[PDB]
Amino acid sequence: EITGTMRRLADQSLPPNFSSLENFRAYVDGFEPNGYIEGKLSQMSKEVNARIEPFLKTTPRPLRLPDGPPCSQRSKFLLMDALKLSIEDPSHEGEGIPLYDAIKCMRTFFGWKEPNVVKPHEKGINPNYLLAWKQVLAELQDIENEEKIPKTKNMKKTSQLKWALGENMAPEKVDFDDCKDVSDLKQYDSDEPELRSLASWIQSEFNKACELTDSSWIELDEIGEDVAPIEHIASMRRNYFTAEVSHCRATEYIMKGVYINTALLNASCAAMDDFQLIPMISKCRTKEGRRKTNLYGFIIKGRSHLRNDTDVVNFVSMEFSLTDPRLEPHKWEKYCVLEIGDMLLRSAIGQVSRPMFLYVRTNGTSKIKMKWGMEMRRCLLQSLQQIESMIEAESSVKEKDMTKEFFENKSETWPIGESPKGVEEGSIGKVCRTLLAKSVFNSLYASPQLEGFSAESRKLLLIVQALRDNLEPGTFDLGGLYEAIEECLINDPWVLLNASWFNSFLTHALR
């Protein structure tokens, strides 16, 4: 039963014109339908409607990309400008001590010079970056001179690493009782991200992240012996896929990211109070099958007392490269490029002697970004599932397997890319590589803007597809959809590039 306070609350939780719960129940029990809905529809205003606005070939308009200073690189490691100091080594995956491998790779290039800055940070203490590189090199020499190679090396807590890794930077936590009259006491700056425009470099990076390399960046273990015919067909198709995807450079980026995030996570979970030194490593098989090990650069994890799964562990990332920053200065906004050496590479002409650069920067990653970077191998699954779906869909019509001619005969091709001559077709191999590169870049440049844009643009893409199928689409408020889409494009280079692709697709479609 209901009595006392519960009844006094129940008497106040009824439609406005009722006074007691019992009266409301008596009214409802005696209720019988007498055209109330049809009576209120006419009474309601006629301005409340759902007018259908037909969607036609002319209705859609290009998305309104933001305007501002050009965007800059934000990935945790250089993608297109990534030198590799390699040394042939008969080892697999994790075999070997990373520090020993790194020092051995470093002892192959003999052109080291005295570092000097060639593109300052514009906001930092660049001499600090120069001294950090000096200290890292001295520490590598130190470890090399030692008898045994420690599994991990903890850097000395000097002023340069202390500033670069942002130590003692956090304001001291205090209760509000005394910090009340402070003149500048405010709320944490929470404002819309600074708007930035689309640059030309992201397109070139995505281009280079789809080409076929001359190595083998992924070497997968064995699988249970095949017995059923489906297993044999699957093995043939899987050979095709793993050949067409192991040589892509997007797989090199996958492996780099996986290794970097794994190493950072393991080092930050153990040495939560010392500055480690985590060299970047990646191993591949050359075209002749010889094994190799690569050394992109070094990472110096900072103090990493991570509590929530969003905290930040600062790590100054030092990377080699051959590209001079004085060509796309708006892209290297947050780095502190130095000139460390002068390689003597061999080309179709022979010796060329280009200078070598070191792209130093501070950076940070949280305990969730590290996890989702360690789990970066699902890009292969996404792209390969799409390709498998396409191949099976085609092969259903023709009662026989179609993978062989798809990958070898250079048969039916898909429209991928856009050249001045028009849209350029691409074979199934290039479609697989392009989808894999798209997934890898989604993983690398993940952000809320990407999620919002992806959803709000899938909506418009489905509308356009319905138009192209002569289904007579129709929208209630298209302007609202466009405004929602354009609200997501703020400053993320990947989101801007995706919006550019969508504009190009709308241009080519409906025409």
Partner: peptide, 25 residues
């Protein structure tokens, strides 16, 4: 199966910018 991209340009670039040779090898 050995992948072969028509845009291969295996001779177009004088040297791979990322994975060079430098060393006498």
């Amino acid at each position: 199966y050995s992948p072969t991209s028509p845009s291969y340009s295996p001779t177009s670039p004088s040297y791979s910018p990322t994975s060079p040779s430098y060393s006498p090898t």
